[PDB]
Amino acid sequence: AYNIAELRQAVINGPDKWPGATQIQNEDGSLVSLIGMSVEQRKALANQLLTPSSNVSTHTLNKK
Amino acid sequence: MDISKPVGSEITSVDFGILTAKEIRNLSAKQITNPTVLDNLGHPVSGGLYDLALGAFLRNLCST
Amino acid sequence: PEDFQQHEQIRRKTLKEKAIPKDQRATTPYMTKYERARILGTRALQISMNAPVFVDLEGETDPLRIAMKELAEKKIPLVIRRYLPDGSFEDWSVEELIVD
Amino acid sequence: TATTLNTPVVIHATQLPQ
Amino acid sequence: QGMETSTSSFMKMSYETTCQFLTKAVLDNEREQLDSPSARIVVGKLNNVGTGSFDVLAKVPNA
Amino acid sequence: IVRVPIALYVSLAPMYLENPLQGVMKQHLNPLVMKYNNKVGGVVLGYEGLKILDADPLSKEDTSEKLIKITPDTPFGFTWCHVNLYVWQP
DSSP states (O other), X not given: OXXXXXXXXXXXXXXXXXXXXXXXXXXXXXXXXXXXXXXXXXXXXXXXXSOOOSOSTTTTOOOO | OXXXXXXXXXXXXXXXXXXXXXXXXXXXXXXOOOSOSBOGGGOBOTTSSSOTTSOOOSSOOOOO | OHHHHHHHHHHXXXXXXXXXXXXXXXXXXXXXXXXXXXXXHHHHHXXXXXXXXXXXXSSOOOXXXXXXXXXXXXXXXXXXXXEOTTSOEEEEETTTSEEO | OOOTTTSXXXXXXXXXXX | OTTSSOSOHHHXXXXXXXXXXXXXXXXXXXXXXXXXXXXXHHHTOOOSSGGGSEEEEEEESOX | OXXXXXXXXXXXXXXGSSOHXXXXXXXXXXXXXXXXXXXXXXXXXXXXXXXXXXXXXXSOSSOSOEEEEEOSSSSOEEEEEEEEEEEEOO
């Protein structure tokens, strides 16, 4: 809850603009790479960072 | 290491011993008899060193 | 079902012998550098996983800084289990220990 | 599915079924 | 030769002459508790020195 | 219909530290209901009397606060918990 201010901007900045983000790890362990993505897709992904999980098995977990 | 994947067990100690001939005959998935590793066409020959019961090998599903 | 109960009773009794009572601990009253470092690290790891926070975040985003802030105000809900070479141990809450 | 966050690490019976 | 006597087989194996120490440890059926700093690296456990010389317990408010 | 007392070794996330009992319920016990369990012997229908075994042995059994051992690598805690399962075993 205290992190989405910086992590959202890091996801938006992408892998080739420091400070930035290179990967997103969902609760289930999916490793979505930010390398081959456009800025619009990165904004869509960043807006879904702190979205509560829909799965009970990972309801105690958050993305990375 | 992933901090979101805790491990519940832990190795406390190890001890050394001889692997008796009776147990290996039971744990084994297959024994090797032909000293030819793979036949023509590059396929691993069953009963050889590269057997599908010893593990997946070069895009071939493990028989075990 | 009965073998497991015997094992459980044996293990719990052996642990109860190990535990040094609160009025017999003879170790240092201060907190060692390693103890403070691991307290901060574990508290930061917990905070990073949406653990409840007992301090006010003055616009802080570093979990380690949150842990340091809680350690300054002695609001960390952790316990150090100091181990003697025999295997007997002592329990000190972070509040009881005095930093530096 | 079948994770340490979902299933118990070890489960033992304490007493006989009653 | 100086280290010939020690409870941790992994240390003596990792130092030198791995096979002689391994034979001595397997013929004596020795069991090591993973207490040496070198022994815990083989199995991949937290060390027993410094920050690994104690445990950390949480105080959960509700029984 | 049979009540079986069991002790399970279960994990606890940091988000459930203030409510460890409800955390054990929502993590390990609620998914265990209405599903046949091989280590019990039937269709688990419910649980009752959940109690956490304390990490320090010198505390009483009536203490509201207990100790949970945190994993060295992760922030997760692990503890033994006793509970009576109501199960229909066919």
